[model samples]
Target chain A: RKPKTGILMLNMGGPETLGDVHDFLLRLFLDRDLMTLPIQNKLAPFIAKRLTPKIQEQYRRIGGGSPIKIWTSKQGEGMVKLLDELSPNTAPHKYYIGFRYVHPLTEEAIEEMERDGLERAIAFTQYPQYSCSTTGSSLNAIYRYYNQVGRKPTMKWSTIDRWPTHHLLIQCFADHILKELDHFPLEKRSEVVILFSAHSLPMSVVNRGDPYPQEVSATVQKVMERLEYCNPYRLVWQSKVGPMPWLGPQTDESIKGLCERGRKNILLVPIAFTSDHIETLYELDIEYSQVLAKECGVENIRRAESLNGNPLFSKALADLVHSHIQSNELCSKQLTLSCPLCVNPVCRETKSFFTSQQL
Target chain B: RKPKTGILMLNMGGPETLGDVHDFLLRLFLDRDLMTLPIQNKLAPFIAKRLTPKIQEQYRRIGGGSPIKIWTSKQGEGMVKLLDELSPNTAPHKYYIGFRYVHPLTEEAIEEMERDGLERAIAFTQYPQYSCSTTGSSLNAIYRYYNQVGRKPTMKWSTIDRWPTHHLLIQCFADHILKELDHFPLEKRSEVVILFSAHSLPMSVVNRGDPYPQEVSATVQKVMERLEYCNPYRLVWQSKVGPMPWLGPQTDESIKGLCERGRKNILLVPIAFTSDHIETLYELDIEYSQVLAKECGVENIRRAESLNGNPLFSKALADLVHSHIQSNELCSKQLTLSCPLCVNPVCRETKSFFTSQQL
Candidate 1:
């Protein structure tokens, strides 16, 4: 690639195969910014050890791998292709898939970018809703990698940390939900309780004031408004881990609650996620939508297909980055803030480093 | 008990006696609003059972009981007396001690208020910093008490949910820290690292958008500014519970960090707490300043006394409530907004119930 502006697509990459689960969990749990536990160096291995078996089985049940890496790359390729066509000023935009945890970690991406001689790059978070635990954590990884090398990023950097309710994104979600709603009989579709399930943060994380919930709610609210309130809906949480309380009503409970209320026909919309992953692929599609639906005696139920490979979503990605580049804002206002109770020494350092970079 | 306005002081009451530890833990752990653990109804007992012995020993070492009740009552009595003297219009202001967990539960206080036929009252949070886990949880207990009875509050109510950086409050904290610093030699006092230690929160809670961290930081900043940066300082967290990550820089670690840097002289300020309790009496005083200090080879160290029954602090309580009454605002703006990721169904309802009251 010739001196192109790089779009570093940032995400918490899932384990691509069953074999990757252990190392993936180790990388994930060991992160203080993400996990926030005491002595994670000591605790992470034991936890990753305990969870590896269970998680490996989960991957085994779902084609022995996560498709996030493939989908993310494909999505980026399409989005960049469209970016070249529409926003020719930023034409020849090259996409780099940057994972926080998996192979091609953020560090690798930066090194690759330097090797490719890119001078300007945008750190684009894959998570629509900005969360200290997600996008913030991802950004921190970017800083961590550079810090480990004892330097700042080689390129001028800008960030798209969050775009939860971007109109095109909302349109994309609405289109998918409408398509999924048609899975139910026409007469029963309006009565269906639309369950918008997103991953649950530990209540500990939620209470600290992560922006994810409200931003996630903002997306749900806007999507519903776009749907013109054609159906009843609720934002529920899913994939809660451990014994701690998480944001709720949980997807499992919501399904049962709706069933008990005699509103059986339901469309499950996975929010705050882009491509298909275990959370959506297995948790929603299998456990809740199918098994739980059957167990709850639901007459009909369907999980909206993930935005993976959706051309509408691809355009959203392109349009969002196009304006982000044109607006000349280095990062969102929210990204500049650290959580009120944040104890991390690196939080301010990471933001200071990123914000100091030229666009 | 006549027609004077009431002041219902809110707190999460600590176990008063070693004997009360189990019940306190049970009551505390079972609270969904506070603990946020899974199946707390099932988990609370086991945890309480497991922890009672360990906690009882701590209380035993600290004179076999928590002095919080005595201190809180003394503080409230003096504040009420001052309120009556300063603002005669709301003269004979009756004070009611309301505890979320432990004896004198908020239920009893609300019932007491109803018995006294009080028609107007201010719910003053003992917590200077507003945390969904603390003052918010205490406030929710007020709602739960009324909710269980299937009725709105019997009297008109107002709330003082947070006042972390209130001038008088800051004056009180700064005064204590100044006094504590004097314990160190004058030659070293200026160099002492003032460690403003507050109760640490879980990383999970912090990430979820809890206001405690930011609000706590606000208190620390203003206090430092008031002292005109007279001495170098760092805000550290103390009394982290459980295995999950709590907020960073635990008091013990901070002591070691400071001592290692050859900044051994230190003054520990216990922020976000009102009176002498285990966290102050034991954790800060013994474990950190004494035990940890001895271990770390600290040359000079002292934990500042909590704002317990200090007339300056007592006056702050009175003045804070006085302005609270004079302003006639129902609650703080922050009290009106829920945490971004709050999952509690009662969060909105609790605020609705409180704010609906006439000032």
Candidate 2:
């Protein structure tokens, strides 16, 4: 009989329809895992109410809604197929997505595991570069659910929490950059500046020793090395939400700086996100490439494609899981370590819970 | 003025001549970091006396002495050459080797750093995979040395303690395998069983959650992947001493098992050691290939070349160091975590000391 394994792919779910925008924003604000606020219980609903319609409009302008759900579902399908072929020792794989703040929430996805009675499962983070705000939030939700239900102690758990610099993951990003770079005229190809814009964290989050910045830098460096550093690249931050000083220079601001310096030919890479969402479709595609580039009045700008249905990405996930299962490690040694100044009780207990799992 | 950075390479130094054998064995037994025993100080000298002649004769047969000293020196020279060209930001590199039980001990090599007063230095482990019995022991020595001398508290230090499966390191091993397979006849090359023989650790050490076994397995998997699984391979242990059960099937016993199954053609790769030593020369080449293969009536056998002066291995070392320095991490987060069952006072203190060092 083929052995069975469950892969719980974790992400911050985007609104699949215009209606999900309010509830998604409210959940995002209320979770102290992502960000804390004064009187957040009252403030969360107030803030989310103000922001919901604007974001919904932006999503409608780009398409009907976020493509993240469909894209991630497709990615899950391909990854499971490859895992069956590549890892027969753990064959007949089952995949479930545990999104933090939307329909098919983490609790719902994990309930499937509870109902299916899978013997073992891996909590695989969709975010490659780990941050307390994102992956941490999703993980806390898992612990929260398990605590409430009095989880089955027999079901062994492990995690593929972060893999920022896996070679094939680098290959996928490098392939995108290489393909996009050629879209430029042959004369200007060598001179094109590669801007690797990742989702930004609050400065407060960064100051607490979050590993995201360094992990993203490693991803950028490996991709550049694979490209033989043929094009000059600078890692910049994107999607800074508020005025309280997130990690910067922001992508728009950096583009302005590059334009002022007379170096406008750019290849914008959404290096952090694995698939198309508001961040790629609305934030980068419509806001930056069309509006910002036109305003700069200088040269060509194109965003490298996301790893939505990329075969290399699916294979990379399968290979990563293959090694994880074969090695018999519960999770990476780094997973048990938290940010230097982290004081979240949920964060502490969640890590301990995962690390305590046995085969 | 160029930034002066020092690299102190650490290894288990072998006897340069037969005369050094007794003292080398004495020091090895005395090292609590490598292994501990009741009344070790008194027993160490007596044990070394008994083992001296047997080991000295083995060394004599392999060559006049172990080639580790010269091989390591050449590796350090080339790695620094590449670093100077590749990382000019920390250029004018100074390279030094510190053998655990021989000339230029870690303390002696560290003294050169104080004398020159280099601003920063990386204590790079020559061992690709870390065992508490090896790299951890060397690091404990560094901490021990620093404490005894009332050392320069301002001298910044970090380590490149492990890099088991860096891509170019995998490339070097894969290249050796490709070249060695051709040494067999064309038709029989397809039938060659690739055996990766790594130095074994006592089960006591393995039980303490030593990272070595899993690390060695990763290195083997990567090489096979690079080869596209063209030949069957297995990772086995060698050089187990003192009748203590070590991580095994012992290389010799595994060869016998293979011979029994009518699988004789083999290519032995010393996957653990970066260069030639008694393990490669006396243990693998002389004892296993010449003596055991002959006894087993093996049709043919060959050993893959060690990464003695392989430019790719040197470049691999350079690349690993380059990433470490640029990552702005004092050491890998894994370095801060000791083996689960580790209770050694020295091991705990040594990790604390290194993790505390600030740039």
Candidate 3:
């Protein structure tokens, strides 16, 4: 008989309602992997409480809740469909959602998978770009869960971390940008500048020589090649928080300079953003446009759409899954299993612990 | 003769180089309207110095500089071009950049405008969603200049404040979202979840009924109605700083919960941001997605693109300028000129002083 396979989709869970915001914040702030501060254990609860009401208000503005669970479910549904179509000869493929915070956590997901009598599972991360703070943390959680349970599944599991240069992923971005560029006038189409914006990371993370920045840049380079258009373009960073600095040629500044130099027509592409969220809906549309019009004086500024639920994007994901299954590995053994300069003892410990358990 | 119109664009400037990061932080922290700590003035400098190196590190990643001045210059150029096109019968328009912090400060911009021998000018704020800390601060700077110089622009000057419910602005967002929705398969397009994420502001600001939250919500509602697609959506907050409660159902938590519920097809739209900035590019795209995938278990999550240099958006802005010019007032008289519950003595004092000076 063909072996039963389980696809475990790993992610961070969100609060469904305004009240759940408190619990979500509490868990997040308490997580050493997410929030590190002096006396973090003692301070996190207080901060969560103090922060809840305001966070609740934010939820109120956005229909008083989150749709993360719904989206995840939908994604799982799509994956299930894709797996069924692509791997018909294999045994039934079961998909599970394992969240690090809130509910439907990794432990619960693994328990359910165990109940289903799966002989093997793939820990597939939804993040195309990886960092220790993110993918590393979730993997740690799974190991810790196994440790606490004092029992390993009869099944075997492997993992997928980052896939920045995935061909399908790059093509999805390029196709979307090409479609969006059509919104501009034909004569001035070439004049439309493309800005590949990625999220910023603290130097602390980069100082560890994390491959995220390089991976992100590679994604852009591949996407541009797929685009096949010679539109003027650059990559910039956004969303710096706290007292620390992150990456740059910051998006806002880049746009301003472009406009000052008479490159008025622009197509702002969220190179790293895989979905529609506040950053795209509010910051880029509302805040940044103010700078463009009222400050930079650019008249024609627009954005390339995200790859949310696009058939092509979904197909790309399915392709990645197929390839991963064929190779039977997280990625090439040539890639580092961890950040090159990572000093995160917890991450290192978890990786060793998981490997030892596997042995 | 049509008078030479020098539209003075006011904004909060950022550091242009890594070296300037220290001074920029110092100025921001010192601002009473923005940072209201216990003995803020005394504490601000100490805090700013303590915070500089980390901030400098952030700048280094973003190309070792800030792009605010360049953006402002570009914005001025665009405005000049628009004013010429729209108000062609009027004198040729020239625009000036006025920063509340960093270089080309308000006084300098005004001094330069004065030297230009203009006969009329407008004190136009780039902040479409007004806050006392932002717009009020810039207006106060202008008045303070008058007090110090004991001279005003030989050119007649007027001002324009907030435009939260601008129709063209709302339409631009709707059209952008509409275009973005096309990325999803038509059959499942309506199933796409929309998360309207906005920037978080302290409760201290909201407690005063600062109108930001309400205004932000109004914009969302209007955009949705315009979108005409009954996609499930929510509003959330992102890029929160400090311990004080800022806004709720923060984007991450909301997305997590949605995944837990099995809703996975999400399209995050940045409701407040107008350009590709850190908030949209970093927090929403990078940080939030990591959580969605690594913690929330969402697989099919992506963001709608930002409205950077979009023609419809620029047209809307141009319409706003033309309307403001026609109305000859900051906003309709019905709206409160300042925060309804504001207790900021500095803001009040400055407003009163400036009002009296204007008369």
Candidate 4:
């Protein structure tokens, strides 16, 4: 074969302070790539302009800033540096990061990679789960740039589209969920119902046969099986937007109804997502927990530690990357990183890790 | 004029405890309205059954519950009591709450209304803004039911959609944002950026011509323009769901970015959302804030009080309802409660909101 490839990573960016909320809103609204028009044409930007300041006030009450982008970049750097040290052959696999919006633009990064004389790179999104909206969207943007005349980088592509059921990743989440549960009173342990929540999507996506919801279920099933928690559990959606009907039972309703019905113990397993994005941190941690405790009078709600800033998780990710490279080395180009047609891989043996409903 | 009709208040529901999250997840996942399926004939049910157990595990961390339903019910009860005390025709006006998924299904409530032989009714969702996804979806569901059965309500319809510049509502939010400032050392107040965050949707929706994001921005812009704060502010999106491309500059990312830029103090205003749901409590307060303060080193993030449980807000809502009623007295029908289509005359006066740039 030719020279070994470099690895580049992408992640969602975050705000630095409680104050940066408004402009961030503008950025969100302004990104045409995210909110496809005719809505994005005017509606998204108008909302961004109208809603930012009021939102900033809410952020102030919480401890004031989100370090996600910073942390994500750090993770990227860590992976790059780790690869350099851990395995020299993969050292050719330089790791770089580019956010979908904001700084570290994909094109800019690609140009930098070109300058570094790197060819045949693998592009991966930091999110553990594969969603067309996220990783698919990000990659689409990058490819669009490549589709243009001058910006094209070498096409020797390798991808790890989704790694939802990686052994170490599953173990990390399972361990985190169990450990978080330790804080609950023992008597309430069995009473603890596990809620595995992912982000919501339009009902139309499901109508069109997006396997996202099924893949989410598959990951949860595997993790539960591994952890051996016989407790009752569920898979739900959180944070839906737009006019289209979205996937349901919404996270908020389920928790409140449970409180009304008089079930006391509860635990939330945010299985379909990874990282400390606003959904996990604010939505799952602050917004829901406080409401459940103060408004509904439910006791003992807790969120498992997301797979970020954890050494165990880092190791798991490293191992996944390392294995992919090692496998690629042995298997030649027959082993592509992910399936082109599906965002997630159906089988573990496939490069598109999260394309299918089963391992 | 005949007797006024009772109101049916709508709210986003919540889960009670960590344990109850599983059932809640199942409820959300199994709903066909929410999750469109390639094969709802078989896949939806299987997905719901297969996934619920692990979902409960996610909710276990943050006190194991969400109280959206209870709080929503409380809000409804509160409105009823308030109306009883305020409206002279309250005796004829009943207030019923119908959660979309849980207890008292839409059809069930309509059946009860049919059984009661109620003549005229005003169908309304609790959210102050008009989003195609949120209030519109709920309204569509109700309308779909009516259309299927060929039982449209008597008289006509009126709606309170897109009240972004409502003077009283703005004052209430301003009061909340200002009150929060008092907790901080006065000198540091100017350093704050008031972040007004609403739920984020994909830019694609904007592209598709959804006006939800724009409506959110209109509300935020009005709120900020009204407030004469010494500090700066902006709008942002929160509680974004799915892996799809969502509106950008997420609250968490904005927070971190601001901190890196040396803007330490931050305040959050959840403008598009009124009550304290999972998005406000767990997402903003404990998860995002804790992460920022502990890891990012940003200081003094404060959450502005939610519009719920505040007497000022209660009064404001009552005022809006009363004003609408007063206007109804002038209509030719003289129905105490205007038809849903006619209620928000201003909604027609204003231009349709948009977020993305039209291609």
TM-score versus the correct structure, for each prediction? 0.54, 0.54, 0.48, 0.46
- DockQ order of candidates, top first: 1, 2, 3, 4
For B234-327, candidate 2 gives per-residue lDDT tens digits of 6667888786556565788777656655677988999988898898888888898899988988888899999999998889988888888898
lDDT of 4 by residue, A59-112 (tens): 554556665666666666667666666767646556666666545666677666
lDDT of 1 by residue, A220-307 (tens): 7668768865775666778887787676657787777667656678788998899899998888888887788899899998888889
Candidate 3 off by > 4 Å: A1-3, A53-64, A290-296, A330-336, A353-359, B1-359
Judge the docking of candidate 3 as incorrect, acceptable, medium or high.
incorrect
lDDT of each candidate versus the true structure: 0.81, 0.81, 0.67, 0.60
lDDT of 3 by residue, B321-357 (tens): 6776776653332122334344555554455443443
Q: Candidate 2, which segments miss by more than 4 Å at Cα? A: A1-359, B1-3
DockQ list for all candidates: 0.03, 0.02, 0.01, 0.01
Q: What root-mean-square deviation over C-alphas does model 1 reach? A: 11.0
Ranking by lDDT: 2, 1, 3, 4
TM-score of chain B only, all predictions?
Answer: 0.97, 0.97, 0.86, 0.81
Better structure of 3 and 4 per TM-score = 3
Clashing pairs in 2: none
- Model 2, A1-359: lDDT tens digits are 43378899999989999998999999889987777799999999999999988989998988878888898898888999999998877878988988898978998988887677778888899999888778878778888887888755446888888887788898999999999998998888876887788998776666455657656766776686688657755667788876765655578776766665566788899989889999889888888888887898748888899989999899998888888899886766555555534657787788888888876
Note the chain A TM-score of all models in turn: 0.96, 0.97, 0.88, 0.83
Model 2: lDDT equals 0.81
